[PDB]
Amino acid sequence: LEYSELYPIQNEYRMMQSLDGMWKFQFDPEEIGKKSGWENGLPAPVSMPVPSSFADFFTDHKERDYCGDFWYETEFYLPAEWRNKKIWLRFGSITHRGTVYCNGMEITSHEGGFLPVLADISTVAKPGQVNQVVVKINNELNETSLPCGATKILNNGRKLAKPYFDFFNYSGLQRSVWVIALPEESVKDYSVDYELCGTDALVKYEVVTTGEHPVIVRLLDAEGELVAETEGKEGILQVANARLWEVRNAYLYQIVILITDGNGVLDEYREKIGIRTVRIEGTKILLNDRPVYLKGFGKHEDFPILGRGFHWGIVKRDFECLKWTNANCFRTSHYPYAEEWYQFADEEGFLIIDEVPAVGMMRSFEALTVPELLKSHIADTEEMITRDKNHPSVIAWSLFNEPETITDYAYEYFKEVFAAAETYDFQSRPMTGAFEKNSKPELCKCYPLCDFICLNRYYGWYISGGPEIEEAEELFRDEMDRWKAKELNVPFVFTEFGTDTMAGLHKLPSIMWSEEYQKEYLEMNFRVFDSYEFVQGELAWNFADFQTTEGIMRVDGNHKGVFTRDRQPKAAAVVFKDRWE
Amino acid sequence: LEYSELYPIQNEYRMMQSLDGMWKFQFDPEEIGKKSGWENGLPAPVSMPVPSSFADFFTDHKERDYCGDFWYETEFYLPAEWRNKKIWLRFGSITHRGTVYCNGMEITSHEGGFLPVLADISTVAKPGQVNQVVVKINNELNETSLPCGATKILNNGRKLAKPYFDFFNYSGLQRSVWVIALPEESVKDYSVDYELCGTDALVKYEVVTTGEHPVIVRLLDAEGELVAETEGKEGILQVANARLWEVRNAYLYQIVILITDGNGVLDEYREKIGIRTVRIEGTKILLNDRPVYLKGFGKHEDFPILGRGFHWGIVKRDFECLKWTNANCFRTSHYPYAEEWYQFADEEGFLIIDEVPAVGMMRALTVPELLKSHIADTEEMITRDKNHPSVIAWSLFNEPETITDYAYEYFKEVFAAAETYDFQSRPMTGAFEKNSKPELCKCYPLCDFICLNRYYGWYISGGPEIEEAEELFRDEMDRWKAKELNVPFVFTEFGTDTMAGLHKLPSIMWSEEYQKEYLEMNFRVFDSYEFVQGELAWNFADFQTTEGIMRVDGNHKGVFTRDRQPKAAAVVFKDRWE
């Protein structure tokens, strides 16, 4: 990458200033901002919070549903001390694509709305003065970038997003924004990998810097005491009597990476890491050499009013609810989340399946757009893995959600994605993706690429729901018998199963949409899961009710949450709590 | 005050760094922290977001309902370039009271949970190093500090807050936290007051600094162009063809305050202000010499999960909802809000009645101490908020006892204090409950306009008795009319608990239809009296209260739900206020 993904820190060598707050904002329905000087300042802005999704603030439909180009602006004072450092704007994300301007100059563009955007403003920054940042953003959906969809044109050329995915097209500056200053020679990237040796451990590492001066690497324990030190950009840290990072029982060391000159230090980067191994052995998932059964949910970055906007309060509540259910895992369905979610999972000992936004890829892999889509998918995979690889919580990469997989075309597409992912992950940890039912065991060509197989299944909701639930159970067992007979010797994880459930809808006997049917559906699914030895995890769809596009199938978004949108449990939450205990 | 209330800014002379994020946090039920050295670091902390109330994160009752001492900690790197500056920790608030430590040293304490806390760490800060802040906080309620209540001790020693007020006892670090650096000689306070002179205006000002060097004051228009400049710590800026700040049609100038020596500028403070006048003339409220009728709500700082935690998103949604109803005013019921609410009101042209947390004083040797607390909170509120053009009135109480001579003497002291702190001498008021009968109340003459909280049709003769409620309401208003006080009356509360989705024909108390009918009846009564000059409905949105047999998941008198969506009655306000 031509920039660093490393989370920003502040110390003697690195500086950081938050640009979060109220920005200026303007919609651009006629696509005239870049023709009209807007990169030097918006002509008739309103106020917009950052971080946040813009949609749910407004009281009119056309602003909520806006699709097209729209702009953000803010001003910030840069301390004179930052002069001649490498100065960058760092956006947690820009959703979905955009161009960054600073002091009237085009700096960089980015495609992909769920990973950091880094803009090098070293040559245009004004130290000791007020500076301006303007961002042109676009939130249309197409078939050459992730997540996929279409853009419809209504009356008066008003655009409307048409997702191929079941979540609302929230967009804007949904994560924190910083301006930062780095030394001219800096730590750009590093990678760690672990090996357990009886009661000791090895931390294998590589460091990439932007120069040729010597590198020293230190490892500190949780108290800040030195436990290992080595020289060189590649090496091994030896840790006696290592305190391993364990499921729901974390321990974090600090890695400290120094570039030295004398005599003297040029840069220092520090980050918490956790010593742990993950691997697949037969049908088991092993964490530090012991089998673990995954228990948890698919989530979303979704909360009332803020949309996908980041807030630590949402993280805290969601983790307290997860712990109360006795979960140990979640999937970042269906896009990488803000970095802070992983930082917190590292602290709390949660396991993460980190998912790239490759959703919306099946009708309703032969279009001439596919090679461009592949390039986008591989780029987002590179960025995700480079950003997230050193979190101990991240134990697997999900590289798709419900694509077509039964053609040779699809196999060739995913072979390239998996090959790229493998080159980027220093740990070579498990790679997977979530399969929809159309990927029948007789037809699917892509499950062999996976270290373990993730299934999304809705036997008892979309298939034979309600009065037909006993037929659903038989259909489900018939499919799992089909997988069983293939003797693949790999773990299977259910990454989705659920029922829309309206809080407060009670019925005896139960009906589809009632709280009681959610419980009965879950109990039937558990009976099926527990009938197969190779099942090794269950992540329910969804942790919480969340927003979708309006339609006749969605009663104020998706109600398959086990919790409501405001994070309170439906009756089925206790079913999980009791089973997972 | 021994510190500045001015909002922090960043420029060549002033630096700021946000401490918002995940802090460490630990409950201290046995009150052992200080004897155990927790000011040097918490021994077994959990993570806590800042800004936020702590209560609604947890999944267990005892943590949600925690009452007593509890502690926060974080660490921050201080740039070496901040050496030789005055360095302060600035808390938007610390709820309700606390003691700030930095690098293990006690810095300052504060009582009062809704206004800034400033801690001067100049003598203990370590530039170029990692620094530590630890705060001991307590959230108990008593009768000598605001808002009032009691603390119950359960038989096992566990404490439980018992408010004398109808809102949940949220607490913690609910607002943003900064560490800031100021020049050694700085602008500490300033005040502006406006006079209209034909097409022109005068901005009278005073500036307080921490030294003796000369002061220059400049006024810039909204395009940053210089329109007036003068010298001295007291002066008058003359503005030709002034663009006045108008209701729901703001214009903001920028005041720029410079301290200089013979070699240049020492400090620069700048803030947006709006040229406008407010006064009461007979039964009218005049804004820029024209009557205005107040239309809007009482609010709360209250949102799901965050509690009272500050977030600009809540500000943005709430103002879009307010504008959609065609409101022009809100009261900061029942405590000053985060500063950002007022900044945004200034931009949007909303009028604010700014209220000190003098709530829970209705049915001692504790009264003199309560008065001291009440006056200190008043001083801090007015010093913090006086230069916002949106703030047009101070509310100095909500539903106290007012019928005794004793209460008159108490409130005479509060109002006299408020007058001394407000350079603009803006209108002053408070909200009265029905027990303050027109024949008995001794305090309404202290007020420049009278604010009434009424619930005719809810607590009085509700439901099938609403016709009687209307007659009782007209009887009381006829009693006020006959007194011919020649002051404006504003209804600061009226409403009905209303469950979203509860529909009934004919209506019942708690249904959406009854909320509409109740509001229509109240409007018929309001419109019957010339001296009524505003109506602020209770409440903008459903909000959290203490649990009880009268509160179904908090207070449901909102016109919006807690997640900011309109009940049926919201359209009734929209149509009326258009």
Ligand SMILES: O=C(O)[C@H]1NC[C@H](O)[C@@H](O)[C@@H]1O
């Ligand atoms: O229909 C649903 O509820 C779900 N179907 C499968 C998808 O992977 C999910 O994103 C979606 O929400």
Ligand SMILES: O=C(O)[C@H]1NC[C@H](O)[C@@H](O)[C@@H]1O
């Ligand atoms: O009973 C209510 O709804 C209200 N009564 C009067 C108080 O001023 C309010 O704070 C309170 O919420």
